[PDB]
From a paper:
Homologs of the dot/icm system are found in most Legionella species, but also in other pathogens, such as Coxiella burnetii responsible for Q‐fever, or Yersinia pseudotuberculosis strain IP31758, responsible for the Far East Scarlet‐like fever. The DotBY hexamer differs from the DotBL hexamer in exhibiting an ααβααβ arrangement instead of the αβαβαβ arrangement observed in DotBL. In DotBY, A, B, D, and E are in the α conformation, while C and F are in the β one, yielding an overall twofold symmetry. Interestingly, the two DotB proteins we have investigated have different hexameric organization, with DotBL consisting of trimer of α–β dimers, whereas DotBY consists of dimers of α–α–β trimers. The DotBY protein was crystallized without any phosphate or nucleotide in the buffer. Nevertheless, when analyzing the ATP‐binding site region of all six subunits, we observed a striking difference between chains adopting the α and β conformations [Fig. 4(F)]. In the β conformation (chains C and F), the Walker A region is similar to what is observed in the bound structures of DotBL and other ATPases, namely we observe an unwinding of the first α‐helical turn of α5 rich in Ser/Gly that provides space for a phosphate to bind. Surprisingly, in the α conformation of DotBy (chains A, B, D, and E), this α‐helical turn is present, formed with the carboxyl groups of residues Ser173 and Ser174 (equivalent to Ser159 and Gly160 in DotBL) contacting the NH groups of Ser177 and Thr178 respectively. With such configuration, a phosphate group would not have the space to bind at this position. Interestingly, in the structures of PilT, PilT2, PilB, EpsE, and VirB11, this additional α‐helical turn of the P‐loop is not observed.
The dot/icm T4bS system of L. pneumophila is powered by two ATPases: The membrane protein DotL, which is part of the coupling sub‐complex responsible for the recruitment of substrates and their delivery to the secretion channel and DotB, potentially involved in complex assembly and secretion. Here we present the X‐ray crystal structures of two DotB proteins, one from the dot/icm system encoded by the L. pneumophila genome (termed DotBL), at 3.19 Å resolution, and one from the dot/icm system encoded in the plasmid of Y. pseudotuberculosis IP31758 (termed DotBY), at 2.75 Å resolution. DotBL and DotBY subunits display a very similar topology. A DotBL or Y subunit is composed of a ∼150 aminoacids long N‐terminal domain (NTD), comprising 6 β‐strands and 3 α‐helices, and a ∼250 aminoacids C‐terminal domain (CTD) consisting of 7 β‐strands and 10 α‐helices [Fig. 1(A,B)]. The main part of the CTD adopts a RecA fold and harbours the signature motifs of the AAA+ family: The Walker A motif between β7 and α5 (also referred as P‐loop), the Asp Box on β8, the Walker B motif on β10 and the His Box on β11.
Residue numbers in the entry:
A (entry chain C): 4 to 388
B (entry chain D): 3 to 387
C (entry chain E): 255 to 387
């Protein structure tokens, strides 16, 4: 009899066997009474969650692969998710639990929001799903909390073109963009009206953001649209004033960005890139050489603003966002255009961010002077990104 | 008489005149298993041989005819169409379990040995046959003392964060080392506890029978559950891991991803295909271009907590021992490597540092040879690396 | 992909025997490196030097009899040789270096041609042709 820690219960008795969704939501609510941040359901062991980092459970009892089946059905958008697992489809979605006992908000109700990975695992000779739900912030964060200046973000919200924030997956581009949108519709900004976001996992919601001038629609991209391509095709059919599209990852995504931007919309894109030059080079590489000239021109002409961002740990032990950014003005853009060689654009962009932009070296210098980062961190920022 | 592979004396069986039945075949298999068999080979041209002590042993000079190997092939495959499939050019790998009646586990029920059985086209005396190969599949993680590791040293190998790397040529030793280290992690109070993901090629070791108070393990198979290792890590970020067995670091993307995982909260166990720790450093650095190579060296030094190269050397006795050289990347070491001026001397300086503060291969061969285990020549080769 | 598979089989701990369609050892190195793009080409050169143990080029030449003999260049990749190859700060030179090293430490086609010629196995003309390989 060896067991992970189990909680003292608030409100409910553990089910004999998980069958009804309401038992599962009730379990999540029990975990939340204990301020549980993440929940792992896996076959061999009891449903667990990480309270203050440490694993815990509500009971000694383990789960059958059947109840892991059920729970997978409940947390995931799709039905019969295991066939999608064997299709080597990556299953990240979102899952919501409203508080039972009339815990209400400043308004009218109170909801808890979860990022659900379902991952293939191997247990006792059989393929299974493990489920992990991470409680994630529900409402976008103010600029001050993520360390953005209103002046700069006003810098980054054109009437038209593409605004890209680049970075590693764990660098909170999504957070940056959610903040920037919340600010967009809470303040008087050049971009106003119908804003659409297409999100794989929808993370932040804008239900509690009151706007004077703008309405926002969010669409989850596996579950509500089959593909990003479809969602962007549909976006133009709607009357968007801003399209938060996906990652610019392949030729087709980049081309959809081109179309949206050239039909006169702000386009918010993420890129999986360490710095701005690297973003440009990466996007250009997506196109075959035959089309790559056209693609380059489109890219320089539709781009208005490029942010690469990293999360760096700061003297305190917490981590903040270092940002390098270039604003693509008419002058910057035309100067990128008017090269002897277009293949050099990437290089140029490097140059240009040093000359007119906010390079990573400058950002590390100014973070280090205000004593935010330790000096090693600043050196690392300057070296590359 | 003709030149012959070695035959060890039998255990609990008389050699079958001819391989008539799968129960005969199995009895042969567990006779082999008494002579602890890494792997067992069936080919029509020769008598059944197994890899005992990494050499080839045969129980009898008798050589199986093609029909014998057909029967065996159909038993192990579990498919009559095997040669039918072999002409169909479908590659035939499966699993074959044999249970030794008399032996039983600490708890459990009935003792089971798995084999991975590949059946592969061969060409001999003028035509196509099948060769069968059964690789023994490791049972359970071995205790650390059993595998030659002290609890202290692995305590060194269990940081709160960063990357512990084991380096070696052969996968077996790495899988074993890391599996043992993970069992120890689960069974004992250690800095790293909670959610443990492992991204394995062949899931060699299973943790069904490891009691943990605090930790859970999720194992995912190399090709088939996760197509990539990139995919498996990117998804790993979604899974609130408390330790990530990343697999091998090979390409730039693998080691940058490892950097990412470490530079969030949680330990990364990586294996590397290089002979010693210096060679590990140099190899990882090779993946990075001159321009990026400084940043890459910084990240590599700052993220690394511990480097183990192992080899297998042959003891005087007639067995195979793991020689380990290791360096623990303590804050002093990390500062010293950061304090370098060239920063391209980091490999050399890492060698020097292993000499000064680590466990060099020379010291390991000196200690092995000082005890009975290894002769002077094998000690010489071991010191040479 | 073949070259990379050979890499992995080697580094998974196994002798790999491989055929290469190049004239001589330098040509082997250079050709193998050509397969890999500049972005990956450092990693590729490091893998290739670290995993290569021995390079033989062969050709058939006419014996004085009229029969054919196999003249062989070979370099043996000692740990010394590989350590030397790795530390050339520019890897564009690796191939060249190999040549040099083959000339210094290996059995170049010139030396094999001298060796056949001294044993009277080969005429001066095909000796000259062969040294030029």
């Amino acid at each position: 009899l060896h067991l992970p820690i189990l909680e003292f219960k608030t409100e409910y008795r553990y089910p004999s066997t998980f069958e009804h969704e309401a038992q599962f939501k009730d379990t999540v609510l029990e975990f939340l009474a204990h301020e549980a941040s993440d929940i792992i359901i896996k076959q061999g062991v009891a449903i667990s969650a990480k309270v203050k980092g440490t694993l815990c459970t509500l009971s000694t009892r383990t789960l059958n692969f059947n109840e892991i089946e059920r729970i997978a059905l409940w947390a995931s958008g799709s039905s019969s998710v295991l066939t999608e697992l064997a299709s080597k489809k990556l299953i990240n979605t979102r899952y919501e639990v409203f508080h039972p006992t009339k815990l209400t908000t400043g308004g009218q109700k109170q909801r808890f929001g979860y990022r659900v990975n379902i991952s293939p695992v191997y247990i006792q000779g059989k393929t299974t799903a493990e489920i992990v739900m991470r409680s994630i912030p529900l409402d976008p964060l103010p600029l001050a909390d993520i360390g953005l200046s209103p002046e700069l973000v006003n810098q980054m919200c054109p009437d038209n073109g593409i605004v890209m924030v680049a970075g590693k997956t764990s660098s909170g581009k999504s957070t940056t963009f959610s903040s920037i949108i919340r600010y967009i519709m809470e303040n008087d900004t050049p971009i106003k009206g119908h804003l659409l976001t297409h999100e794989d996992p929808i993370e932040f919601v804008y239900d509690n953001i009151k706007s004077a001038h703008s309405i926002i629609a969010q669409s989850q991209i596996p579950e509500q649209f089959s593909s990003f391509a479809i969602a962007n095709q549909e976006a133009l059919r709607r009357t968007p004033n801003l399209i938060m599209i996906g990652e610019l990852r392949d030729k087709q995504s980049i081309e959809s960005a081109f179309e949206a931007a050239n039909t006169g919309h702000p386009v918010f894109a993420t890129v999986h890139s360490q710095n701005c030059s690297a973003v440009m080079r990466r996007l250009i590489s997506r196109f075959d050489e035959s089309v790559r000239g056209a693609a380059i021109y489109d890219l320089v002409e539709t781009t208005r603003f490029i942010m690469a961002q990293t999360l760096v740990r700061k003297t305190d032990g917490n981590l903040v966002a270092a940002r390098e950014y270039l604003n693509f003005t008419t002058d910057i853009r035309e100067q990128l255009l008017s090269l002897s060689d277009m293949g050099k654009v990437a290089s140029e962009v490097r140059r240009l961010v040093d000359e007119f932009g906010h390079p990573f070296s400058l950002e590390a210098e100014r973070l280090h002077s205000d004593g935010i980062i330790d000096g090693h961190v600043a050196k690392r920022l300057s070296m590359m990104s």
